[PDB]
């Protein structure tokens, strides 16, 4: 007999590590349908900011225009969402972008010959021969000056090589960075990889003490199995440390003395980030999206 | 987009025509000219 | 012989003769052998298969008998034979890199795959012919699984987000 | 090891083409039936 | 002809330009190699297309 | 025939999620 | 049935050569005609449509048309087709007067 | 719809349109791809759209796919599930399959939707579980019962069928009965489902529903099973790896010891055709003189090929018949390489044998590997070599590799299968065109006589019995027509 | 008259060469990749006369 | 109810039931003329 | 051409690590497996993108019709 | 100021009417068109 | 015997109709030009091969083509007489 | 296509999330059906899959020159040992989970890195459609050729396939 | 006053007269909420049948189907499941907050 008060008696979270870019943590005693839905929403439904419309004024370099437009969109921007709003598509392009929807980046690079002493390195040999992603400067439109004064728009990885040039060539563009979700295009996905794994279960069946237990160590990562003596013989220290290689299931000594399975309601989330948001904050957004994905169906008339 | 042609029928107006389904030159106002073709000939020097 | 080819000793030194190198077993030196000679010789394939007092020659490498494009197929001795023959035709018809001097040419049409990669698994003759100057393809994390249901009889499934990040994009 | 991708050997060669001698000499030998057959019209014995 | 990979780049070619073809009207054709009979050696073929030629031919 | 030469100098390069080099 | 002058690369065909071959007239343009209202494309699999079905792309669905005479029962749907016009899919490309 | 070499009338069938978004490709179901002889490698098909109501009444009633279930060549079915819906019904209808209540109701509604008109009752009915007391669990055979409970009409009783599988009983263990398919009152009670049941196979379950319930129900059951074995595949996948292709070290010693007894096989067949005896050695000058005599004759070389090929096909048949169920590392259900071959999903037992055991004799134009003027089959071999390997016998397999000599003979056999294909279709193409001008206005008249177009009489009944070929399948299946008497009434 | 041969492939000759066909002597070097292009220079052909045959010897 | 229907093109069907499985027997010797050349006589 | 910005499979930013990779192989003189692990590439999806990259843009840039050769 | 580019010496070159299409530093006939500051738009996809 | 060698089952009803066509004149007639020579439909013969050869034999005959074979109805554009063209649909009007 | 003649069209750009995901978080770029390999017998693709994943982890290139290995020196033993030192399964199998449902799969999935090529002929220069258009001047029939918006051919045998169904109005 | 009503839709062609059986069709959904909601409706002791079904992956439509026993219609089982999934995301969000405030 299930109840939401019985779910709360038996639900735990163990946070193994938290960081600016990644977070490993456990969700104990939750169903696979709910734990998949948090993974499902972190990849797609959580919105993030990326460049969408690119306006080339000149591109005289070797890289094509649409290839170089595609490379700007994949550059992750260090912008907090809930500082922008959503664009509205049922109205024309003069009315579509405001200072509340859009972040305007620009890029203006020209390459020239450098007088240098001599196969020489082309950073000592040319001026502006490498367009990095930090050369996308932020242009505050409208009132994005008193609200972005704390945090200007900078790419999350400023050393991304966008293009390479030779003298004579130039790149002069201007891009609009709109808010979108990972289901539309992959460049809005706010996460490098969110994924989970089940806790492995390593069930020893017979006591396998002694010299067999020393060779039982080596079928696993080193922190997994431990020994003490013939008593406290060969036990599991850290099954969470184990990757399921099934190395022990191919030695005929051990193929009946152990069984490998999972703990089917212990999920180990590893949530990384593309830099725009902290990884514990794209999990709070993900559980609030699924809550607000259900309110909008409850607070809704059932048609026909 | 259009090309100059004869006056359209149905008492349309002095009009100029435009091939649209590659074989039916309509008028400006959408009247398909009755019995029009846009022929070609097939090659798949030498 | 008895009712065989007409006997004789025929030397040839002219133009236009086919020639390939083998190792002459005394002196361990390279010899050059043409196809008129080869019918009556005894050329061992590997040195491990040199039998006493029949073999006078040995191949340098057993891969001197394949083509250039038939030699770039990874582990070609494990595929079935019509599949090594079909890669040799499919390897021509890829969109790869025609050349780097494309702004000084004007052809009817060129196909240009944008971001090529070298292969992790490759032959040693991939580097002798300088095939790195013309990268033809890309390394995909491929999973052999029947999961979706839309991949039958030959069809495959691409990833969507792999494609949005540019995966076999070309002009 | 068994084989290598020659990553620093490519990148020094892409930037700096060799000023003396073509690398990859098996590639110029693979059209010696064509280039050589046209060279024999004007070179060799008896002009 | 006697030209470096550096100098082929300075003359707007691929650095490992291969040669072997003709440029005719921009189209870049080449002469196909053929298999013909070996020179200067009497072959001893038998063929049914010889009795087709005249009477009393074997 | 000499065998294919084993590449010497290999080590563990796949770890569980949340564990980098805690193994010696 | 002539002699000609030279190797004029199989000289100028008469009115019998227009009839007697695989190509010509009587087998290429009487048994083997080309048709209007037809489309071809590469096929792709689908286990989500029925077995007695085809998945028509939206490219083909805004080109191929059916002359539907307007009567008292399809007036509600053929008015909606003309309103959508020849770009939105449940639509129509042209009408025919009486 | 039309696949372009249109060799028979089932290659041009009539489909119902279902307009999809986001595509540029025509898009087909897998039941149709055996009818058109199409596969998804880049094939194109022609889509014709008829322009009046007389032709729409004939693409729905005469040339639709539902009436094209049986081909008229022999009366055999051509429509069924093809590759991975086959290999999913050997897992779903297995005896290991146990679904819980949340899972059982999900595989029903995943394939049977009442909104789209799949049901007959407008309320999805389910079955009691086959386990009550520890935990309620449904069997995987019990899902096939529930999907036939819902798509068949309620007034007719259940189906009754006794058939077989392609999988022998000994792959499942001692005393299993999983080769016997049994349907009693519409309930699958025994046996797994294969290509032999819902593939393009005769007297299966889909062929039997076609007879009792009609073509409209049999076309729904292929769609319902097309969605059932797709949601089960997405929840429970199917793979094939390197471990599927490996013999165990016990059984890998077996193929070595049998192939150790093949080094003498080439000489003994060559000593037999030369009418010598006593194991005369291979370097005997009175032996090599006879082999040269054999070489110059096309007759005598045909004898030496046939003796030596049939003698080394025995060693090929001893390695396979000892290893492939027994010497393999992974046994049958877990070894997906065998389960794709035993189910008839893809491949044969010959493909599995060449991967795991050895390729065998590379027979060229029926005879054996050709030979030079010098008595050499390659420059690697001694002239007039009485080795089995020198004649083209490959003792290597595709798992471990084939030597350079036997890689060259295998390219000889690979090319004669490709030059014969290029000359295949031009032969029988003109034979069919030439029949379809005489036998082209020949039709059944209303007095059941077969007449030509001008009225000249050809036969007095069609075959002497006036029976359509696509109807007489269960006409002499009297045990089937008695077990289903009331449903067929 | 030599550019015409290299443009069409038609061996026009009064005196008659030893060859047995008069067409297909030159082909276009395609550049769809490098493997297509490097294999025109290793391509050898038995003769265009032999595809007319009905014998697979 | 399993009879042939009047108007059925049994001439095309009988010719498509012979020419179509004859695209399946082009192979060589496995005493009498075999396969398609026998069928062409 | 130039290094992809993101990995194709996971989606980690990979484009900022190409010039750091060539410094490790040239200046610090490591093998390829140790230089990739020091840049943070550890899933073998993103590991084979810096590893296996050709970088043909240095070969394209030699042809410049905007300056005297 | 509208300009072109010589295909040989890469010198920028305004070309009026009633002028032969040649470079004016070398004499090269083939002459390629430069690109100017002009707006085009893309989606970053 | 040809099909049973390759383990291909064809029904005897097809083989009896091929055989009863080849023996329709008491002789052993082929499927070729010479077997087709004794037929009624001129356009069937003209569309097969040697078109103006059969046309010569038909014009000298002053031969009326009855337009009944399906190779002669596709030429003139008449409805084919096999299947749904093997009968007529007639509408029944109520008033006198 | 891969380097083994395993070609086939892209059937669906399958969305990322409901695509199976490994223990590592890696989601495959290409899913290929295992039912290809029994009739193809392309086992060079299984060992390329196995040598490629060994090479990505250890930072090494592997050789795939033919006849380097041996029946006593099987590459499944050679590259599987390199995976087992890296920490993966010996057989190239990986524990994957279902993207749709979320549960783990039945067995482990054979994953690896294969060098895929992209062939040059695509649907954008294969498909055509015609409602009506340009005709021929002699026969008043639709014209041959796609760029001229021309028509699909109903040839000789397709006439016979419509007589065989007995549908005289589709033929008409 | 414009509330959205093109989101959830009761398919009347498959709905029983009593309301104890009904099918629905949500737009712009998939396995995300289709499986998470199906888990919570099945924990109602009156739901006899429940399952979701995506009719075609290329369009964003989601058919779910609830069949009850009695004394609760199939709409009242949908909105009871949507309330207990709202309450199930509060437990996850509030446990995961208390473990960040505890580090
Ligand atoms: Zn008008
Ligand atoms: Zn990655
Ligand atoms: Zn100049």
Q: Cα–chain-centroid distance for residue M31? A: 12
Q: Does an H or E element contain N47, and which?
A: helix N44-58
Q: Cα–chain-centroid distance for residue N109? A: 17
* Listed resolution, Å: 3.0
Give the strand pairing for E33-34 and N109-116.
unpaired
Give the strand pairing for G53-56 and H16-19.
parallel
Mapping DSSP to helix (H, G, I), strand (E, B) and coil, where does residue K44 land?
Answer: helix
Q: Residue C56 sits in which domain range? A: 15-67
- Own/partner pairs, H307-311, CB within 8 angstroms, 24+ separation: H307/H269, H307/H272, H307/H273, H308/H265, H308/H266, H308/H269, H308/H270, H308/H368, H308/H388, H308/H391, H309/H361, H309/H363, H309/H368, H311/H265, H311/H268, H311/H269
Q: Is A44 on the interface with N (CB under 8 A)?
A: yes
> Using CA atoms, how far apart are residues H370 and H295, in angstroms rounded to an integer?
10
Q: Enumerate the residues of chain M whose CB falls inside 8 A of the CB of residue G30.
A: 47, 74-75
Mapping DSSP to helix (H, G, I), strand (E, B) and coil, where does residue A110 land?
Answer: strand
Instruction: Supply the angle between the helices A32-43 and O74-98 in degrees, to the nearest 10.
Output: 70
Among B44, B46, B42, B13, which residue's Cα sits nearest to residue B30?
B13
Superfamily of domain H240-403: RNA polymerase Rpb1 funnel domain (1.10.132.30)
Given a contact cutoff of 8 angstroms between Cβ atoms, the answer to whether A55 and A174 are in contact is yes
- Angle in degrees, CA H88, H10, N122, rounded to 5: 70
Among A245, M76, C135, which residue's Cα sits nearest to residue D14?
C135
Identify from F12, F18, F21, F22 which residue to disrupt to test chain A contact, counting A C-beta atoms within 10 A and taking the largest count. Answer: F18
- Own/partner pairs, H56-60, CB within 8 angstroms, 24+ separation: H57/N169, H58/H14, H58/M84, H58/N165, H58/N167, H58/N169, H58/N170, H59/H14, H59/N167, H59/N170, H60/H14, H60/H16
Structure tokens at H134: 């520890």
CA-based nearest distance A149→chain C, Å? 32
Q: Is A118 on the interface with D (CB under 8 A)?
A: no
Instruction: Supply the angle between the helices H205-212 and H215-235 in degrees, to the nearest 10.
Output: 150
Given a contact cutoff of 8 angstroms between Cβ atoms, the answer to whether G51 and H219 are in contact is yes
Ligand in closest contact with the CA of B12: 1
Number of E/I CB contacts below 8 angstroms equals 51
Query: For chain A, how many structural domains are there in total?
Result: 2
CA-based nearest distance C6→chain I, Å? 23
Given a contact cutoff of 8 angstroms between Cβ atoms, the answer to whether H416 and C81 are in contact is no
Q: How far is CA B5 from CA B16, B19, B33, C4, H407, in A?
A: 5, 11, 11, 84, 71
- Backbone dihedral angles phi then psi of residue O38, each to the nearest 5 degrees: -60, -30
Q: How far apart are the first and last CA of chain G?
A: 54
Q: Residue A136 sits in which domain range? A: 48-186
Q: Enumerate the residues of chain N whose CB falls inside 8 A of the CB of residue D1.
A: 60-61
Class (C level, CATH) for O1-103:
alpha beta
Ligand in closest contact with the CA of L10: 3
> Using CA atoms, how far apart are residues N110 and C140, in angstroms rounded to an integer?
14
Name residue N109's beta-bridge partners. Answer: N94
Structure tokens at N165: 């169904």
| One domain, residues A56 and A159 | yes
Q: For O18, which DSSP code?
A: S
Given a contact cutoff of 8 angstroms between Cβ atoms, the answer to whether N130 and G39 are in contact is yes
> Using CA atoms, how far apart are residues A222 and A219, in angstroms rounded to an integer?
9
Structure tokens at N3: 């380097």
Q: How far is CA M79 from CA H308, O7, O45, in A?
A: 63, 52, 66
- Angle in degrees, CA H41, H42, H44, rounded to 5: 130
Q: Which domains does chain L have, with CATH numbers?
A: 1-45 (2.20.28.30)
Question: Edge-to-edge strands of the sheet including C29-33?
Answer: C29-33, C20-24, C57-58, C43-44
Residues at the binding site of L for Zn(2+) are 6, 9, 23, 26
Given a contact cutoff of 8 angstroms between Cβ atoms, the answer to whether N19 and K10 are in contact is no
Identify from J14, J28, J35 which residue to disrupt to test chain M contact, counting M C-beta atoms within 10 A and taking the largest count. Answer: J14
CB contact under 8 A, N29 and C142: yes
Given a contact cutoff of 8 angstroms between Cβ atoms, the answer to whether H351 and N41 are in contact is yes
Q: What is the CATH number of the domain that holds K25?
A: 1.10.10.60
Q: Cα–chain-centroid distance for residue H301? A: 36
Torsion of CA I11, I12, I15, I20, to 10 degrees: 40
What lies within 8 Å, CB to CB, of A218 at 6+ separation is: none
Give all chains having 3 or more CB-to-CB distances under 8 Å with chain M: G, H, J, N
What lies within 8 Å, CB to CB, of G81 at 6+ separation is: G90, G91, G92
Q: Does an H or E element contain A174, and which?
A: strand A170-181
Q: Does an H or E element contain H418, and which?
A: helix H404-422
Q: What is the CATH number of domain H1-68?
A: 2.40.40.20
Q: Is E25 on the interface with I (CB under 8 A)?
A: yes
> Using CA atoms, how far apart are residues D10 and O36, in angstroms rounded to an integer?
52
| One domain, residues A148 and A261 | no
Instruction: Find the catalytic residue in C28, C77, C153, C154.
Output: C154
Mapping DSSP to helix (H, G, I), strand (E, B) and coil, where does residue H233 land?
Answer: helix
Q: How far is CA G23 from CA G28, H278, N156, O103, in A?
A: 5, 68, 11, 85
| One domain, residues A40 and A65 | no
Given a contact cutoff of 8 angstroms between Cβ atoms, the answer to whether O12 and A303 are in contact is no
Q: What is the CATH number of the domain that holds A14?
A: 3.30.1360.10
Among C155, G43, G30, G47, which residue's Cα sits nearest to residue H46?
G43
Q: Enumerate the residues of chain A whose CB falls inside 8 A of the CB of residue K60.
A: 62
CA-based nearest distance N34→chain D, Å? 30
Q: Is G52 on the interface with H (CB under 8 A)?
A: yes
Alpha helices in H18-167 (DSSP H): 53-56, 86-92, 101-109, 141-151
Among A49, A22, A32, which residue's Cα sits nearest to residue A182?
A49
Q: Enumerate the residues of chain O whose CB falls inside 8 A of the CB of residue G53.
A: none
Chains O and M touch each other (3 or more Cβ pairs < 8 A): no
Ligand in closest contact with the CA of B31: 1
Q: Enumerate the residues of chain D whose CB falls inside 8 A of the CB of residue F5.
A: 1-2
Q: How far is CA H57 from CA H63, H68, M81, M83, N165, in A?
A: 10, 16, 17, 13, 13
Q: Does an H or E element contain N67, and which?
A: none
> Using CA atoms, how far apart are residues H108 and H231, in angstroms rounded to an integer?
10
CA-based nearest distance H139→chain G, Å? 24
Is C31 labeled as catalytic in the residue annotation? no
| One domain, residues A135 and A257 | no
Query: For chain K, how many structural domains are there in total?
Result: 1
Given a contact cutoff of 8 angstroms between Cβ atoms, the answer to whether O54 and O30 are in contact is yes
Give all chains having 3 or more CB-to-CB distances under 8 Å with chain I: C, D, E, H
Mapping DSSP to helix (H, G, I), strand (E, B) and coil, where does residue H108 land?
Answer: helix
Place of tokens 């039997």: H208
Considering only CB atoms, N126 lies closest to which of G42, G45, G57, namely G42
> Using CA atoms, how far apart are residues A43 and H265, in angstroms rounded to an integer?
64
Interface of N with J in 127-166 (CB under 8 A): 160-161, 163-166
CB contact under 8 A, O30 and N18: yes
- Backbone dihedral angles phi then psi of residue N69, each to the nearest 5 degrees: -85, -170
What lies within 8 Å, CB to CB, of A170 at 6+ separation is: A58, A59, A60, A61, A109, A110, A111
> Using CA atoms, how far apart are residues H160 and H480, in angstroms rounded to an integer?
8
Residue that terminates a domain, selected from A186, A209, A229: A186
């Amino acid at each position: 007999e299930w109840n939401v008060e019985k779910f709360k008696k038996d639900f735990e979270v163990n946070i193994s590590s938290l960081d600016a870019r990644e977070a490993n943590f456990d969700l104990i005693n939750i169903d696979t349908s709910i734990a998949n839905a948090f993974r499902r929403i972190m990849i797609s439904e959580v919105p993030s900011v990326a460049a969408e419309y690119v306006y080339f004024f000149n591109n005289t370099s070797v890289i094509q225009d649409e290839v170089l437009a595609h490379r700007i969109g994949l550059v992750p921007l260090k912008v907090d969402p809930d500082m922008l709003t959503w664009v509205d598509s049922n109205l024309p392009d003069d009315e579509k972008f405001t200072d509340e929807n859009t972040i305007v980046l620009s890029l203006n690079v020209k390459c020239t010959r450098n007088p240098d002493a001599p196969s020489t390195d082309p950073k000592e040999l040319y001026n502006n021969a490498h367009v990095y992603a930090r050369d996308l400067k932020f242009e505050p439109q409208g009132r994005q000056s008193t609200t972005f004064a704390d945090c200007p728009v900078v790419p999350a990885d400023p050393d991304i090589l966008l293009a390479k040039l030779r003298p004579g060539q130039e790149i002069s563009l201007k891009a609009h960075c709109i808010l979108g979700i990972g289901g539309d295009h992959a460049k809005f996905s706010p996460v490098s990889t969110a994924s989970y794994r089940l806790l492995p279960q390593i069930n020893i069946l017979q006591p396998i003490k002694g010299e067999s237990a020393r060779r039982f160590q080596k079928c696993f990562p080193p922190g997994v199995i431990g020994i003490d003596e013939g008593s406290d013989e060969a036990y599991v220290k850290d099954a969470r440390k184990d990757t399921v290689s099934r190395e022990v299931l191919r030695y005929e000594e051990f193929a009946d003395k152990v069984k490998l399975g999972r703990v089917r309601n212990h999920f180990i989330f590893n949530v990384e980030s593309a830099g725009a948001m902290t990884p514990e904050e794209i999990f709070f957004k993900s559980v609030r999206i699924l809550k607000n994905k259900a309110e909008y169906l409850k607070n809704c008339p059932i048609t026909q | 987009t259009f090309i100059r042609g004869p006056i359209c029928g149905t008492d349309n107006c002095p009009s100029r025509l435009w091939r649209i389904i590659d074989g039916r030159r309509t008028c400006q106002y959408g009247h398909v000219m009755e019995g029009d073709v846009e022929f070609n000939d097939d090659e798949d020097l030498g | 012989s008895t009712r065989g080819q007409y006997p004789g000793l025929y030397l040839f030194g002219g133009h236009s003769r086919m020639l390939r190198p083998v190792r002459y077993l005394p002196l361990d030196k390279e010899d050059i052998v043409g196809p008129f000679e080869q019918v009556y010789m005894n050329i061992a394939v590997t040195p491990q298969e040199i039998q006493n007092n029949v073999h006078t020659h040995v191949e340098f490498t057993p891969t001197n008998i394949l083509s250039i494009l038939a030699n770039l197929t990874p582990f070609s001795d494990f595929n079935q034979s019509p599949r090594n023959m079909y890669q040799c035709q499919m390897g021509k018809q890829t969109m790869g890199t025609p050349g780097v001097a494309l702004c000084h040419r004007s052809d009817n049409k060129l196909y240009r795959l944008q971001t090529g990669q070298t292969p992790i698994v490759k032959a040693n003759l991939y580097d002798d012919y300088g095939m790195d100057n013309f990268p033809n393809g890309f390394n995909a994390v491929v999973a052999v699984i029947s999961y979706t249901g839309y991949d039958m009889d030959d069809a495959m499934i691409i990833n969507k987000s792999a494609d949005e990040r540019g995966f076999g994009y070309g002009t | 090891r068994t084989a290598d991708f020659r990553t620093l050997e490519r990148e020094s060669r892409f930037i700096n083409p060799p000023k003396d001698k073509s690398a990859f000499p098996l590639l110029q030998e693979a059209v010696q039936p064509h280039i050589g057959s046209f060279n024999a019209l004007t070179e060799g014995p008896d002009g | 002809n006697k030209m470096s990979p550096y100098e082929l780049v300075q003359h707007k070619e691929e650095s490992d330009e291969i040669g072997g073809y003709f440029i005719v009207n921009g189209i870049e054709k080449l002469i196909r190699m053929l298999i013909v009979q070996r020179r200067n050696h009497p072959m001893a073929i038998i063929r049914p297309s010889f009795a087709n030629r005249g009477a009393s031919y074997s | 025939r000499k065998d294919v030469p084993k590449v010497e100098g290999l080590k563990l390069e796949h770890f569980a999620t949340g564990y980098d080099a805690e193994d010696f | 049935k002539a002699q000609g002058r030279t190797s004029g690369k199989v000289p100028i065909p008469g009115v019998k050569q227009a009839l007697e071959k695989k190509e010509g007239l009587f087998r290429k343009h009487m048994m083997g005609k080309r048709v209007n209202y037809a489309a071809r494309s590469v096929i792709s699999p689908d286990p989500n449509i029925e077995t007695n079905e085809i998945g028509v792309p939206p490219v083909f669905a805004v080109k191929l048309t059916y002359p539907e005479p307007v009567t008292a029962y399809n007036i509600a749907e053929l008015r909606q087709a003309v309103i959508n016009g020849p770009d939105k899919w449940p639509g129509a490309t042209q009408i025919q007067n009486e | 719809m039309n696949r372009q070499p249109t060799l028979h009338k089932a290659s041009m069938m009539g489909h119902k349109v279902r307009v999809l978004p986001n595509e540029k490709t025509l898009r087909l179901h897998y039941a149709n791809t055996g009818a058109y002889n199409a596969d998804f490698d880049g094939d194109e098909m022609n889509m014709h759209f008829p322009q009046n109501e007389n032709a729409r009444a004939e693409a729905l009633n005469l040339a639709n796919t539902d009436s094209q279930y049986l081909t008229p060549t022999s009366g055999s079915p051509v429509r069924g599930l093809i590759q991975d819906h086959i290999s999913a019904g050997v897992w779903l209808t297995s005896k290991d399959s146990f679904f819980t209540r949340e899972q059982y109701q999900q595989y029903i509604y995943g394939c049977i939707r009442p909104e789209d008109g799949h049901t007959t009752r407008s309320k999805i009915v389910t079955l009691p579980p086959t386990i009550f007391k520890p935990y309620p669990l449904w069997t995987g055979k019990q899902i096939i019962t529930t999907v036939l409970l819902n798509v068949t009409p309620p007034d007719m009783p259940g189906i009754n069928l006794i058939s077989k599988n392609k999988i022998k009983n000994e792959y499942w263990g001692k005393g299993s009965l999983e080769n016997e398919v049994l349907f009693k009152d519409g309930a699958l009670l025994c046996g797994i489902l294969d290509k032999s049941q819902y593939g393009a196979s005769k007297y299966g379950i889909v062929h039997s529903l076609h007879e009792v319930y009609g073509p409209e129900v049999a076309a729904k059951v292929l769609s319902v099973l097309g969605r059932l074995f797709t949601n089960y595949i997405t929840a429970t996948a199917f793979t094939c790896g390197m471990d599927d292709l490996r013999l165990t070290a016990e059984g890998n010693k077996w193929r070595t010891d049998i192939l150790k007894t093949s080094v003498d096989t080439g000489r003994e067949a060559a000593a037999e055709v030369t009418n010598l005896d006593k194991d005369t050695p291979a370097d005997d000058p009175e032996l090599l003189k006879r082999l040269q005599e054999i070489l110059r004759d096309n007759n005598k070389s045909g004898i030496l090929d046939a003796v030596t090929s049939s003698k080394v096909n025995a060693i090929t048949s001893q390695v396979v018949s000892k290893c492939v169920p027994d010497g393999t590392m992974k046994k049958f259900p877990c070894n997906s390489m065998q389960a794709m071959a035993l189910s008839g999903a893809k491949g044969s037992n010959v493909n599995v044998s060449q991967i795991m055991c050895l390729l065998g004799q590379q027979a060229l134009e029926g005879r054996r590997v050709p030979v030079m003027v010098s008595g050499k089959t390659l420059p690697s071999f001694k002239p007039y070599e009485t080795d089995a390997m020198a004649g083209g016998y490959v003792k290597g397999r595709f798992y471990s590799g084939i030597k350079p000599q036997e890689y060259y003979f295998h390219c000889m056999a690979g090319r004669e299968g490709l030059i014969d294909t290029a000359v295949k279709t031009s032969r029988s193409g003109y034979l069919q065109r030439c029949l379809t001008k005489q036998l082209e206005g020949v039709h059944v008249s209303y007095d059941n006589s077969i007449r030509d177009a001008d009225g000249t009489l050809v036969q007095f009944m069609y075959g002497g019995d006036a029976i359509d070929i696509t109807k007489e399948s269960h006409m002499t299946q009297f045990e089937f027509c008695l077990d289903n008497y009331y449903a067929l009434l | 008259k030599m550019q015409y041969f290299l443009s069409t492939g038609n061996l026009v000759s009064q005196s008659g060469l030893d060859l047995q066909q008069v067409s297909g002597y030159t082909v276009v070097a395609e550049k769809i990749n490098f493997y297509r292009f490097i294999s025109h220079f290793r391509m050898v052909h038995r003769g265009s006369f032999f595809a007319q045959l009905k014998t697979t010897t | 109810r399993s009879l042939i229907n009047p108007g059925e093109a049994v001439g095309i069907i009988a010719s498509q039931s012979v020419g179509e499985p004859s695209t399946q027997m082009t192979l060589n010797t496995f005493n009498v003329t075999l396969g398609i050349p026998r069928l062409r006589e | 051409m130039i290094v992809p910005v993101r990995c194709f499979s996971c989606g980690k930013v990979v484009g900022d690590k190409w010039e750091s990779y060539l410094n490790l192989l040239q200046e610090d003189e490591l093998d390829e497996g140790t230089a990739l692990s020091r840049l943070g590439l550890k899933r073998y999806c993103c590991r084979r993108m810096i590893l296996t990259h050709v970088d043909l843009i240095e070969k394209f840039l030699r042809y410049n019709p905007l300056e005297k050769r | 100021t509208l300009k072109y580019i010589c295909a040989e010496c890469s010198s920028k070159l305004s070309l009026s009417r009633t002028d032969a299409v040649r470079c004016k530093d070398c004499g090269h006939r083939i002459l390629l068109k430069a690109r100017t500051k002009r707006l085009v738009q893309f989606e970053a996809r | 015997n040809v099909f049973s060698r390759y383990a291909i089952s064809v029904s005897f009803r097809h083989l009896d109709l091929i055989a009863d066509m080849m023996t329709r004149q008491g002789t052993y007639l082929a499927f070729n030009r010479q077997g087709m020579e004794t037929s009624t439909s001129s356009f069937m013969k003209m569309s097969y091969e040697t078109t103006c050869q059969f046309l010569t034999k038909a014009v000298l005959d002053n031969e009326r083509e009855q337009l009944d074979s399906p190779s002669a109805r596709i030429v003139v554009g008449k409805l084919n007489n096999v299947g749904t063209g093997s009968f007529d649909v007639l509408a029944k009007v109520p008033n006198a | 296509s891969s380097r083994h003649g395993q070609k086939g069209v892209c059937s669906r750009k399958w969305p990322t999330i409901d695509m199976p995901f490994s223990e590592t978080g890696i989601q495959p770029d290409i899913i290929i059906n295992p039912h290809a390999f029994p009739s193809r017998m392309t086992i060079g693709m299984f060992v390329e899959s196995l040598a490629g994943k060994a090479g990505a982890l250890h930072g090494i290139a592997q050789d795939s020159t033919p006849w380097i290995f041996n029946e006593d020196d099987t590459p499944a033993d050679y590259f599987g040992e390199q995976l087992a030192k890296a920490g993966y399964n010996y057989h190239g199998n990986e524990p994957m989970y279902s993207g749709a449902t979320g549960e783990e799969l039945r067995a482990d999935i054979y994953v690896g890195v294969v060098y895929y090529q992209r062939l040059r002929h695509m649907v954008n220069d294969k498909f055509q459609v015609r409602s009506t258009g340009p005709v021929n001047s002699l026969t008043m029939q639709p014209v041959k050729g796609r760029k001229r918006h021309g028509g699909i051919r109903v040839g000789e045998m397709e006439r016979d396939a419509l007589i065989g169904h007995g549908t005289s109005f589709l033929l008409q | 006053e414009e509330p959205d009503r093109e989101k959830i839709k009761l398919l009347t062609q498959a709905t029983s007269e009593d309301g104890t059986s009904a099918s629905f069709q949500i737009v712009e959904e998939d396995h995300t909420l289709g499986n998470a909601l199906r888990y919570v409706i099945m924990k109602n002791p009156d739901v006899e049948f429940c399952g979701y079904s995506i009719p075609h992956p290329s369009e964003n439509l989601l058919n779910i189907r609830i069949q009850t026993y009695g004394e609760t219609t199939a709409v009242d089982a949908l909105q009871k499941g949507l309330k207990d999934l709202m309450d199930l995301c509060d437990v996850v969000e509030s446990k995961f907050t208390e473990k960040i405030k505890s580090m």
